[PDB]
Amino acid sequence: IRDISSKELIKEMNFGWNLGNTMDAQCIEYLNYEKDQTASETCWGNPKTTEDMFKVLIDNQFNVFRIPTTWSGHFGEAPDYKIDEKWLKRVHEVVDYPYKNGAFVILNLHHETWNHAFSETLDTAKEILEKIWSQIAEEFKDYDEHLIFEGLNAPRKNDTPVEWTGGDQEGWDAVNAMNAVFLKTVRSAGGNNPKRHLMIPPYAAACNENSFNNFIFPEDDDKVIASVHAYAPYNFALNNGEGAVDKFDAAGKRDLEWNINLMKKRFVDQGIPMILGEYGAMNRDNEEDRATWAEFYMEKVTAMGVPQIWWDNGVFEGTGERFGLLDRKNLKIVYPTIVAALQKGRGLEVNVVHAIE
Numbered sequence: 093i094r095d096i097s098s099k100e101l102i103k104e105m106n107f108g109w110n111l112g113n114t115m116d117a118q119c120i121e122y123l124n125y126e127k128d129q130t131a132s133e134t135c136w137g138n139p140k141t142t143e144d145m146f147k148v149l150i151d152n153q154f155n156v157f158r159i160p161t162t163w164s165g166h167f168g169e170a171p172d173y174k175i176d177e178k179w180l181k182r183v184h185e186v187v188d189y190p191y192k193n194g195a196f197v198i199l200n201l202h203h204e205t206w207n208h209a210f211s212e213t214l215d216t217a218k219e220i221l222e223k224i225w226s227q228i229a230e231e232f233k234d235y236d237e238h239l240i241f242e243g244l245n246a247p248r249k250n251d252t253p254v255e256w257t258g259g260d261q262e263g264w265d266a267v268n269a270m271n272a273v274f275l276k277t278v279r280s281a282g283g284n285n286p287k288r289h290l291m292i293p294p295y296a297a298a299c300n301e302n303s304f305n306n307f308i309f310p311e312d313d314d315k316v317i318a319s320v321h322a323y324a325p326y327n328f329a330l331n332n333g334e335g336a337v338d339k340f341d342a343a344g345k346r347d348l349e350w351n352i353n354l355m356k357k358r359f360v361d362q363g364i365p366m367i368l369g370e371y372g373a374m375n376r377d378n379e380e381d382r383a384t385w386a387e388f389y390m391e392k393v394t395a396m397g398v399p400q401i402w403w404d405n406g407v408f409e410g411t412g413e414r415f416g417l418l419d420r421k422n423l424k425i426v427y428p429t430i431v432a433a434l435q436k437g438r439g440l441e442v443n444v445v446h447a448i449e
């Protein structure tokens with residue numbers, strides 16, 4: 093393991109891709125994990141992951157891969173919360189796809205049922221968090237700096253009015269406590285873990301003033317990174333209801349600038365490394381505008397040394413969220429001008445490989 097700062101290491105990051113709706117797919121109720129502890133990987137309609145999916149993306153200069161992973165349903169009870177071995181082994185396999193090919197990999201805790209930002213459940217959540225991250229840190233203890241741990245995804249007060257608006261004091265307290273537990277746990281684990289780079293999100297990982305202003309970030313730990321998700325401008329990118337737009341317009345452009353400036357103000361200008369662990373714009377039969385939007389977003393986080401990771405859920409059509417970029421089945425980039433835009437805005441040579449016909 094190199095003994096490098098997060099800020100130095102981040103300089104090796106081009107831009108990234110999420111294996112979304114895969115190891116994060118949560119079908120605890122629909123499936124029977126007891127009977128098949130790895131079936132959840134394909135429960136949201138994505139094929140079982142192969143090394144060849146990563147290699148197509150690496151051919152496109154993507155070199156950071158986030159593997160959102162939902163652990164809930166795959167571990168036992170108190171007090172050990174022992175992670176099922178078949179699940180841990182398959183997570184390991186999926187991590188090695190990018191890792192063995194020389195890229196960055198982020199492994200997290202994703203759609204967990206037990207780590208919501210409420211004070212009634214917090215003691216228990218800390219306990220689970222300590223037990224879960226110990227096991228994970230042990231399993232991967234000899235992995236080098238390319239393997240990054242993101243402690244929690246978007247912890248928040250699920251199903252309340254403040255779930256998404258950036259929280260309240262209860263939620264902020266809960267998130268900051270869970271983050272400290274994660275950091276402590278991994279820092280005191282064996283192998284390279286004391287030197288491993290660690291991501292921690294603000295409340296809901298939201299690009300939001302409420303979350304930003306109440307986010308506690310460690311002092312004198314050079315190897316910690318702030319995790320933000322920012323599907324901005326939401327109208328263009330993520331909105332499926334009433335004010336949705338399919339053009340990247342001047343209001344879109346100004347809403348995105350404003351969010352990028354909030355990140356800049358909170359993180360970059362304060363000497364804190366951050367990664368945009370998720371962002372995307374849904375397919376609205378509008379590849380041209382997504383291309384313009386993608387290059388613009390990428391130029392501006394690049395202009396400030398912040399890498400971003402496309403959220404790819406494998407979904408291209410229908411009325412849910414259509415964030416697919418790689419067709420994992422035929423191994424094609426479906427929206428080649430969007431990859432060209434990521435390359436161009438990162439300052440790389442444009443070269444789109446495996447473009448669909």
Ligand SMILES: OC[C@H]1O[C@@H](O[C@H]2[C@H](O)[C@@H](O)[C@H](O[C@H]3[C@H](O)[C@@H](O)[C@H](O)O[C@@H]3CO)O[C@@H]2CO)[C@H](O)[C@@H](O)[C@@H]1O
Binds near residue numbers: 136245246412
């Ligand atoms: O069709 C398969 C299943 O999709 C589930 O929805 C997922 C969305 O497709 C996915 O785009 C969304 O992505 C989240 C991401 O997990 C999270 O970290 C961030 O806060 O928001 C992203 C964009 O929303 O995850 C959802 C699940 O939360 C449907 O829920 C499921 O019913 C359907 O089977």
